C-alpha cells in the first residue's frame, strides 16, 4: 500500500474495509475516474 | 489500459453482465480533475458515530498536506449509502 | 432471430474485446521485467 | 427499448474491424517474447 495518509483517513471514518480493496479502490480515483461513477461500480458488484 | 486491469482485479476480491458492462460505465476526461462539493463531507461525519472527533481531527490534518485524490475519496465515503456491504467482505479477507 | 439474442450477441463481442484487452496488460509487464 | 438497427450495424463493423486490429498486436508482441 504505502498510502498511509489516504488509507489511515479512510479507515477511521469508515470503521473498517478490505486493506487490498482500499489499495485498489484508491487506484482508480488516481486515474481521474469520476468519483460518482466509481461509487456506482462499488454499488453494482454488491 | 490500467483501468481495465483494476476492474478484473477488483472482481477477484469482489468475486461475489457485471464484468464487461461494468467497464463501459466508467467514462471521464483523460487528464482533467473534477472537484466535488465539500458539503457532503460534513454529512458523512455525522453519519458515522464510531469517532466523534477522531474522524474529524485526523481529517483536518490530512487536508493540511496537499493530496491529489483527497477530494474524491471524501466524496466516495459519503456516497456509501449501502450499510455493511463493504465491511462484510473485508472480514472474509482477514480470516 | 429471436430479438433476445440480437442484443445478447453484442455482449459476446464485447467480452471478446475485454478479455483480449486484459491478457495484453500482462504481456507488457514481462517486457518490462525481462529487459 | 428498441435498437436503431442502423447504428448497431455500424457499431458491429466498427467493433469487429477494431478487435482483429488488436489480436495482430498480441501475436507479434508475444512472438517477440518467444524470440
Curated annotation (Swiss-Prot), chain A:
Keywords: Cytoplasm, Cytoskeleton, Phosphoprotein. Its main location: cytoplasm. One of its GO terms (cellular component) is gamma-tubulin ring complex. It is found in: Cytoplasm, Cytoskeleton, Microtubule organizing center, Centrosome; Cytoplasm, Cytoskeleton, Spindle. Required for the recruitment and the assembly of the gamma-tubulin ring complex (gTuRC) at the centrosome. The gTuRC regulates the minus-end nucleation of alpha-beta tubulin heterodimers that grow into microtubule protafilaments, a critical step in centrosome duplication and spindle formation. Associates with the gamma-tubulin ring complex (gTuRC) consisting of TUBGCP2, TUBGCP3, TUBGCP4, TUBGCP5 and TUBGCP6 and gamma-tubulin TUBG1 or TUBG2; within the complex, interacts with TUBGCP2; the interaction plays a role in gTuRC activation. Belongs to the MOZART2 family. This is Mitotic-spindle organizing protein 2A.
Swiss-Prot record, chain B:
Ubiquitously expressed. Disulfide bonds: none annotated. Transmembrane segments: none annotated. It comes from the Eukaryota. It is found in: Cytoplasm, Cytoskeleton, Microtubule organizing center, Centrosome. The modification Phosphotyrosine is found at residue 75. Component of the gamma-tubulin ring complex (gTuRC) consisting of TUBGCP2, TUBGCP3, TUBGCP4, TUBGCP5 and TUBGCP6 and gamma-tubulin TUBG1 or TUBG2. TUBGCP2, TUBGCP3, TUBGCP4, TUBGCP5 and TUBGCP6 assemble in a 5:5:2:1:1 stoichiometry; each is associated with a gamma-tubulin, thereby arranging 14 gamma-tubulins in a helical manner. Gamma-tubulin at the first position is blocked by TUBGCP3 at the last position, allowing 13 protafilaments to grow into a microtubule. Belongs to the TUBGCP family. Component of the gamma-tubulin ring complex (gTuRC) which mediates microtubule nucleation. The gTuRC regulates the minus-end nucleation of alpha-beta tubulin heterodimers that grow into microtubule protafilaments, a critical step in centrosome duplication and spindle formation. Plays a role in neuronal migration. It is linked to Cortical dysplasia, complex, with other brain malformations 15: An autosomal recessive disorder characterized by global developmental delay, variably impaired intellectual development, speech delay, facial dysmorphism, microcephaly, and varying degrees of cortical malformations including pachygyria, thin corpus callosum and subcortical band heterotopia. Most patients have generalized seizures. This is Gamma-tubulin complex component 2. It comes from Homo sapiens. The chain holds residues 5 to 103 of 902 of the full protein.
Amino acid at each position: 500500500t504505502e498510502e498511509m495518509e489516504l488509507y489511515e483517513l479512510a479507515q477511521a471514518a469508515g470503521g473498517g474495509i478490505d486493506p487490498d480493496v482500499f489499495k485498489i479502490l484508491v487506484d482508480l480515483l488516481k486515474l481521474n475516474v469520476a468519483p460518482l461513477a466509481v461509487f456506482q461500480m462499488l454499488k453494482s458488484m454488491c | 489500459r490500467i483501468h481495465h486491469d483494476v476492474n478484473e482485479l477488483l472482481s477477484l476480491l469482489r468475486v461475489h453482465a457485471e464484468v464487461y458492462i461494468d467497464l463501459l460505465q466508467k467514462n471521464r476526461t483523460p487528464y482533467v480533475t473534477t472537484t466535488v462539493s465539500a458539503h457532503s463531507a460534513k454529512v458523512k461525519i455525522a453519519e458515522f458515530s464510531r469517532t466523534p472527533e477522531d474522524f474529524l481531527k485526523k481529517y483536518d490534518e490530512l487536508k493540511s498536506k496537499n493530496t491529489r485524490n483527497l477530494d474524491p475519496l471524501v466524496y466516495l465515503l459519503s456516497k456509501l449509502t449501502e450499510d455493511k456491504e463493504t465491511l462484510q467482505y473485508l472480514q472474509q479477507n482477514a480470516k | 432471430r429471436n430479438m433476445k439474442d440480437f442484443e445478447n450477441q453484442i455482449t459476446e463481442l464485447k467480452k471478446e474485446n475485454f478479455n483480449l484487452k486484459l491478457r495484453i496488460y500482462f504481456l507488457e509487464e514481462r517486457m518490462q521485467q525481462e529487459f
